[PDB]
Symmetry: none
Subunit: 611 residues, 4 copies
Amino acid sequence: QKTVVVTTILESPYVMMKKNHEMLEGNERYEGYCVDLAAEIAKHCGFKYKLTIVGDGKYGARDADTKIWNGMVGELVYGKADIAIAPLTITLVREEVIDFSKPFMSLGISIMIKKPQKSKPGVFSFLDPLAYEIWMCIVFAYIGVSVVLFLVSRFSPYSTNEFGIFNSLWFSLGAFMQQGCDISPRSLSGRIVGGVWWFFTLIIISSYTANLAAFLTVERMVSPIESAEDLSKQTEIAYGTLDSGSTKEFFRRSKIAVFDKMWTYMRSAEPSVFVRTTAEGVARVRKSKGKYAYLLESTMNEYIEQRKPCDTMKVGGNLDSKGYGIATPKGSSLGTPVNLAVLKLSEQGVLDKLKNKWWYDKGECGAKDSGSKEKTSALSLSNVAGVFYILVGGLGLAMLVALIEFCYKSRAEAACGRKALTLLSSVFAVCGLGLLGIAVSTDYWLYLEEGIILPQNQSTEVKMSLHSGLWRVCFLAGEERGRCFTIEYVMESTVNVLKMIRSATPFPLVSLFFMFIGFILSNIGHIRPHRTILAFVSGIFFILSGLSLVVGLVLYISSINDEMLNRTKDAETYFNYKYGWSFAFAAISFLLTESAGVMSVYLFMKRYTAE
Amino acid sequence: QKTVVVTTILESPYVMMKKNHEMLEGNERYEGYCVDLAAEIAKHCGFKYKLTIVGDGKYGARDADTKIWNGMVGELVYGKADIAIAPLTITLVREEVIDFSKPFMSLGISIMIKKPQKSKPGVFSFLDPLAYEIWMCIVFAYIGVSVVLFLVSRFSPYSTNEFGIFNSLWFSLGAFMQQGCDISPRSLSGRIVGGVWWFFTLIIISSYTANLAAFLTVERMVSPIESAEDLSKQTEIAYGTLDSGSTKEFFRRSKIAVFDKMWTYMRSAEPSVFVRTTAEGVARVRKSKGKYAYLLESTMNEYIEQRKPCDTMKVGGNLDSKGYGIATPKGSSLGTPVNLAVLKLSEQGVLDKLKNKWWYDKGECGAKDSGSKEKTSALSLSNVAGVFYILVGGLGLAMLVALIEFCYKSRA
Amino acid sequence: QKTVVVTTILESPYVMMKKNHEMLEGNERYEGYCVDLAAEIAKHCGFKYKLTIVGDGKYGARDADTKIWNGMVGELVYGKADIAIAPLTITLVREEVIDFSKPFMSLGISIMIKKPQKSKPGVFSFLDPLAYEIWMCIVFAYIGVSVVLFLVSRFSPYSTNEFGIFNSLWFSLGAFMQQGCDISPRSLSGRIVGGVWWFFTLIIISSYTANLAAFLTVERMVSPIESAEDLSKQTEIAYGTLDSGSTKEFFRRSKIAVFDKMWTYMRSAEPSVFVRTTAEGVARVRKSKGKYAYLLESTMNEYIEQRKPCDTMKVGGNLDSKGYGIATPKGSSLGTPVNLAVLKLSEQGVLDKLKNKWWYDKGECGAKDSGSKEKTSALSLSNVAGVFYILVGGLGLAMLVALIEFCYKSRAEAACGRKALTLLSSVFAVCGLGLLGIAVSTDYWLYLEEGIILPQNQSTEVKMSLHSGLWRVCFLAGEERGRCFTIEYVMESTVNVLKMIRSATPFPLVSLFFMFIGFILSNIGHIRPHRTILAFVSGIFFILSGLSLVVGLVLYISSINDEMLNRTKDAETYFNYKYGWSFAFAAISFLLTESAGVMSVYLFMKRYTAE
Amino acid sequence: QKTVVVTTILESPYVMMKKNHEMLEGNERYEGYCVDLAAEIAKHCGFKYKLTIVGDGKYGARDADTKIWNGMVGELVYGKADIAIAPLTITLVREEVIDFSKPFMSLGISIMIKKPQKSKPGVFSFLDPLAYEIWMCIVFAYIGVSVVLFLVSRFSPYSTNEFGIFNSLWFSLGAFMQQGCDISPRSLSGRIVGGVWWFFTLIIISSYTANLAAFLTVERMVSPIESAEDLSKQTEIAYGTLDSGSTKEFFRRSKIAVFDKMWTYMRSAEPSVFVRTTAEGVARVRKSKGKYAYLLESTMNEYIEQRKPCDTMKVGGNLDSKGYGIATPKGSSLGTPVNLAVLKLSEQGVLDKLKNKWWYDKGECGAKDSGSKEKTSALSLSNVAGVFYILVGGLGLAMLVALIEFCYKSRA
C-alpha cells in the first residue's frame, strides 16, 4: 500500500522548523504538536506517511468570483493531499465539502492585558497628603511664634520669668507635637500667643489624618478587569481586534447585548484600535502602560504568556466555543478509523499530555503561575522608610552636639560677649537688606510652561514659556524670542495668573520699609552707646519686618494655586509651574531679619545691666 | 417613474457633508439624521429621490413689502421642490400656505450653564465639617464650665486659691485643645467638672476628624440653579438670548408672571446680554467662570453637551412646547402617505433609534467617559490658608497687649 | 345652524363633576381642563355646542373578531358625535379612520417614587460606632485598674506614697482621656499597671475615630435614583407597570438595550410587580417604605404629586413621546378651522395658562417645589445632642456634691470609724456571695428567638424560642411547651451556640471558690482582732475573685457574638438575642466583691496603726 | 407524513415538567433547554415530533454478562426511538454502535466550594493595619532612643541625674503612647533626641488610624484556592467525588502527575470523602464551614450556584474536556440534516442565547442581586477581645513583681 500525503501549515507551536533543517531530509525536518499527533494517529490506523507543507500558506476560503478554494481545504477537495492534520476550525462552509473528525481541542475568544507589576513607593512618600508649600510654611510659622513669645515675655520689667529663647523654641515644639509642656505662660499676653498656636496645630494634624485616609480608601476601591462585562462599562482602557479575520466578524453580526455595546465602541473610535497583524497587536499591549487590551484566540494567548519577557496575562473566560479537527476528503476509507483514534487518545489522556509538553514544559516563564497567588494590603517598610531615616539621622546629630559641647565646657573651665554680639547683629542686618533688595528688583520669580503632548509616541511639544516678576515679564520661548513687556502691557489663563502677581505687591514693600528704619536706629546706637533705648526699639522693627513678609508669601502662593484650579482639564494639555531664585532670596531674608531682631534684645539687656 | 426632488438645509447633526465628498457624487455626499429619515420614508412610500440643498440658506419667512416667501417654504409654494425633510418648525403662518405632518420631534427652550467643577476654597472653609450652631454652642459651653469651676472652687477650698477666674479659663482652654495643664483640681466637687469636660472634647474632636475623611473621599458637586424660577429670584448670574429669532419673541409677548419678570431684566441690562450668533453665546458661557447662562432650543443644547471640550450642561426642563414637521405643497398626492409613515416609524421606536445614534453614540464624551476618571489630590495651601491668618493676627494682637500692660505698670 | 354634539370622557382633572350636579342642567354641570378648552375652540370657529359623555367609558379600540370600534372613536366613526375633545392619543390605527389635529399636549412614560423624608437621629446616636457590650466592659476595666493600682502601691512598708483610692481613680480617668496627670507612679510595680492601661486606651480611641469615619463615608456614597438607567442596574428596588395597557406594550416590543433589560426583570419576577389599576399602583408606593417604583403617564404623575398627603415625587425625564389631539370624523367641515384654532391658542400661551390653573393653582401641596432645593451635609445638633446632655447633667451633679459636703464639714467642726468599716465590709461580702450563688444555680441567662417574616403584610411569625443557662435549657416556645433538657441532651446554629456556653463554664466557678476562702478569713479576723494579717490576706482573695469574673464575661460574650456571625444571612429570616436576669446578678457581684476588697485594706491599716 | 419519536431524560434544567402538567397533554407538559432545542431542529429539518421520557431512567451502558444496552442508547439500537435529544456524553464505546453529531455544549470537571464570607476574627487581629516587620522595628527603635538618651545625659550634665536607664525607658514609653511625662530634658543634646522621637510617633499613630478606616469602609474577601494544583499542595481542606461514575474513573487511570497525587489522597482517606448522590455532596459543602470541596461537572456546578440559598461558587477552570451530542441510529436518514443544523445554530448565537436564558435569567440570585446589598456594622467585642487579654495578663504579672520586690526588701 502507498504512503499517505499529509498537508500541514507552519504555526508555532503546532509545526516548527528544527534547528538542523538544512542538514536533515524527510520527516525529521519538523517538530511540534501536530508532528507528535501525526505519529500517534498513524500508529492506530496503521499506515506510512510523508509530511508536506501547503504552498499558499492559507487555511481555506472560497473566492466569491471564481468559486474555488485555496489553502489546505483546496488540497483536499482538488486531490493533492489525503489528510490535513492542522489547526483547522470546524465551520459550516467547510463541512459541506470535506469531513471533519470530532474536536481534539476546544478554544474561543479571550482577553490579553499587560501584567500588573509592583512599583516601589518613594522613601519620602509619607509627606504626600500635604503639598510641599504647606510644609515650608509650618517652619516659617514655627520661627514666628517662638520669637514673638520671647519678646512678649522678656520685657523690661519682665516676676522671675523663665521664657528665654531656648525655652521658647522648646515650648512651641512640644505644643505642635501635642506632647505636653514642662512650663506654661502666666502673663496674659503670653497666654494669647500660646492659645492661638494650640488652634493652629489642631487643624493641621486633623488635616493630615483625614487626607491620608482618603488616599488609602480610593486606592483600595481600584479593581482590575476580570471579565468581558468589565471592558464594556469602563472606558479609560481601549480594546481592539485584528483588522480582518473571524474575530472581527464575530463582533459584527452578534446580537448579544454585551457584545453589541463592544462593537459600538470599536466602530466609532479615534484613532484606530484595529491592528494589522498579531505581532503588532502584542507590541501595542507591551508599551501602552496598561491602557490597551487585545482580543485573540485562546491558544495563542496561552502560548505568548509562557514566553520571554513574560509581561502579558490572560484574564476572564472564553467568549464563544469552537473546535479544531482532522480533515479528510469526502468519501474516503480513512474517514472512520481516524474518528475512532481521536476519541481513543482523548480518553487515555494523551491529548492532555502533549499540550502540557509544548505549552508549559518548554515555557520560559518558569512557574509563573505560582507568583499570581500572593495578595495583601497593609503598610510595609517601603511606605514608611523615610520616617526611620529621620529618626536615625536625629540620633546621629545628638552624638555630635554632645561631643563638641563636652570639649567646649572643659576648655572654658581650665565686653567680649558684647563686642561679638555687636558685630554679629550688623552683618546679618546688611545681608538682610541686600538679599531682599536684589529680589524685588529682579524678575526671576515664577516659571510657567504650557504645552501639548504627541500621542502614541511618548513626546511633548511646548508652545509657550516665560519667567515673571512683580512688574516685568520676559518670554523665554514666547515667539521664540526674549521679548519683555510690563504687566500693564497685556497681550487666556496665563493672563489671569499675571494679574494676581500684581495683587500681592504691597507686602514686600512694607517689609523693606521697616528694615530700613531699624537699620538706621541700630547704627546710631552703635555710634552712641548711651540712650540705650535704640537697641530695643530697633529689635521690634526687625520682627515686624518678617511677619509682614510671611503674609506676603502666603497670599502670593494662594493666588497662584487657585489659578491652576479653575482652568478646564484636558487629556492632551499639560501645564506646569516652578519657582525662581528671587523667591529663594525672599525666604532667606526672613531668616536673617528675625535672627537679627533677637540679638538686638540681648544687646539691650546686657548693656542695660552694666548701666 | 419620476424622481422626487427633496429639499433640505445644512445644519449639524441633521444634514452634514462627508469628508470625502469631492470623490463621491449625488446622495453619497451627505450624511446625518434627516438623510436617514429620507431613506426610511422613501422606502415605505415607494419612490426615488435626489437630495438638494436650498440655495437661500434660510428656513422661511414672509417679507412685509413684496409678500414673497424665501427659503425652503419659498420652494414649496412656487414649485421648485416636492417635499422638505428638514427641521421646520410648525407655526400658524406657515400652516396657511403649505401642509405639515405630525411632529417627529418635540422640543422647547432650555438653559445652558457651565459644568460645576472644583471651586476656589474660601478662607474659612476649614470649619465646614461642623455647622455654625455647633461652634457657638462650644463657646457658650466653654464659658459655662469655667464659671462653674470657679464658683465651686471658691467657697469649698479642699490653702491658696490656685483656681481664680483667670486660671479657670486657662484650664478649660488647654483641655479642649488636647494639651495638658500644670494644675489640677483637688476636691470631689472640682474633679467632677474636669471629668465631664474631658469626655466632651474626646467626642467633638473625633467627630471633626471623621467628617473631613468623608468629605475628602467622596466628592459631590451641586449646581446653583435647577429651574427657570430660580433665575428670576437672583441677580448674581446674568442671562440672555440671541438678538433676532423666535427665542427673543417668546419673552416679549409673554403674559406669564415668571416670564414677564425675566424680560424686564433682559431689556434694561447693562452690559448687553444679547449676542450675535450661536457660537458667540456658547463662548460667553465657557469664559465667564459660570456667571452667564444662555437660553436656546433643547435639541442644540443636548448636542453642544456631547462635544469637545465637554464643558457645558443643561438644567431644568423645557419652557414651552413646539415640534418639527415634514412639509408638502398644498394639494400634493404625497401628503397622506407621508403622514402615515411618520406615525408608523414612531410606534416602532425607529425615531428614538436614530436620535440615540447621532446625539449619543457619536458623542465625543459619553456618560461613563467622565464617570470612570477619579483621582485624589494633596491638600493645597489655599485650603488651610485661613488658619495662618488667625495665627499672624494673634501674634500682632499679643504685642499690643504687652504695651498697655507696661503703661499700667508705669502709672502704678 | 344646528348645535354640535361633543363627546368626552370623565377623567380628573380633564372633566370632573361639579358639586351641584344634581341641581344644574345643561353645560354647567361639568368643569375641568377640557371644559375650558371647549369654550375657547367654539369661540374661534363660531358654533354652539352641547356637551355629552360617552356611555361605554372606553377610549377606543378594534375588536379582533367583529372588527368594530368602541368608546369615543366609535361615536365618531358611526355618526353619534361630531367632535371629541378629550385626552385621545394620536396613534396609527386611529389615524386611518378619523382626523386628528396638531397636538395640544406632549407627554410620555415617567417614574413615580416615594418622597424622601427626614428621619431624626437618636439623642444617643454618637455611641453607635461601638457596640453596647464594649461600653460596659470599659467601665469594668476602669474599676479593675484603679483597685489594683491602689493595692500594688499601698503595701505594708509602702517612701511618702500618695496613691490612695481617691488619687487612683483620678489617675486612671486622666489616662483614658489622654489629658495628662498631675502625678506619676515611681515604683516598678506601679509603672507596669500604668503602662498597660496606656496601651489599652490607644487602641480603643483609635477604633472609635476609624469606625465613625466609616459610617459617614458609606452614608455619603448613597445616591438616589434620577433616571431610567439607574433602575435597570440596581436591584433592591422593585418596579412594575399596570397589568394591561399601552405602558406594558411599550416594554414588550421595544428593542432599545436599556428597555430590554427592564422587561427581562419584570417578566421573571416573584411575586407580581404588575398591579391591576392605577389606585392600587399608587397605594403600593406609599406603603412599601421606598422599595417600590411605579411607571405611568407623565400627566397623571404630575397631578398626583400635587395632592394630599403629598408623599410622591416624579424623577427623571420622559421615556417616549406621544400627543393628545382633537378628533373629528373624516371628511368634515370642522377639519381645518379646528386645526388652525389649536395653533393659535398654542402661540398666545393660552394652553400653558390653563395647565397652570388646574394642575398647580388647585394644588393642595402648596409650593412644594420650593422645599426640594435645600441640601447640605455636616454634623448638626441632632447628631451630637446627647453629648451636651451629659455635660449639663455633670455640672448639675457637681452643684449637689459641693452643697452637701459644705454642710457636712460645718457640722463636724462645731473606734467609731473602725466599727462602721467592720460592719460595711461584712454586708457587702454576704451580698457578694449570695448574688453569684443565685446566678450560677438558675438558668435565665440568654434568650434566643428565631422566626420568619410574612412579606407585603408587615408581620413576623416565630418558630422557636428558649432561655438557656450553664447546664439547663428550657424551651419557652419550642414545641409550644416548657420542656427542659440538659445541654448534653442535644436535639443547626442554635446547637452551636449552646456548646459555647459550656466552654466558658470554669471561670465563674473559680471566682465563687475564691470568695468563700476570703469570707472565712474575714469573719475569724472579726472574732480575733489580734494576728492582724487576716484582713490583708482576705482583701487579696476578693480582688482576685473579680478579675477572674471579668475574663469569664469577656470570653462568654465573645463566644456568643461570632455564632451570629458565621451563619448565612437571608432576607426572610430574622434572628435576635437578649440577656437575662442571671447575667445582671453576675455583673452586680463584681461591684460588691471589688468594693469589699478595698475596705479590707483600710481595715488592715487602721488596725495596724493602733497596734 | 410520519411522527418522529424523540426520546429524552428528565434532568433540570434540560427537561422539566411544568406545574400544571395534569391539565395539559402531550408536548405542552414539558419545558426546559432540550425542549427548546427540539423545536429549533425540527423547524430546520422539517418534521413533527412527539416527546417521550425514557422508561429505564438511565443514560446508557453495556452489561458485561448479557451484552444488552439499557437506557437511551438501548432504545436507539433496538429501534424503539428515532432520535435522542439529551445531554449524552460523546464517548468511544457509544460511538461504535450509534452516531453522534458535533458537540452543542462543551464541559469539564470543576471545583465547588462555599462562598467566602465574613470570618471569625483572630485574637490578634487588631494589629492588622501594620505589617509584622514594622512592629519589630518600633521595638528596636524604642530601645535605641532610650539608650542614646541615657548616654548623652550622663557625661554631659547640663545637678542630679534625673535620666537614668530606668527613667529613660519611662520617658520614651509615655512619648509613644501620646501621654505626657513629668520630667523633660534640659540640654541641647538632650532636647534633640526628644524632638525627633515626637515626630516619629505622630506619623505612626496617624498611619494606624488612617488604615483602619480603609479596612472598615471597603470589604474585600479572598478565596483560599483558585486552581487544582493548590488542592494537591494542602491538607487543611478535604475533597472528594461521587462513588460511582465517570468522575471517579477519571482520577483512577490518570497518569498526570498532579492528578495522580490527588488519587493517592482520596483513596487512603479516613473518614471517607466519597458520597452517595449529588445532593449529599452539595450538603457537605454547605455544612462544613468551608472545609470540603466537591468535584463535579461544570454545567451542574454553574446551575447550583444560581439557586437558593446561593451559598456555593465555582473556582478555577476545567480539568478535562468532553461534549454533549445528539444521537441517531446508525444508518438513519436524519443523520446529516441534524449535523448541519447544529453547526448552523452555533454560528448564529442561538445556542448561547438558550443557555443564557435558563442558567442566568431564571436564576434566583443574579450577579447584581448580591452586589446591590451593602451595610456597615458596629465593632463587636470579638474584634478587640485580644486587647482585654493583654490587660488582665498585665494586671496579674504586676502583682508577681511586687511579691519579689518585698522579698528583696526583706533580705536587705
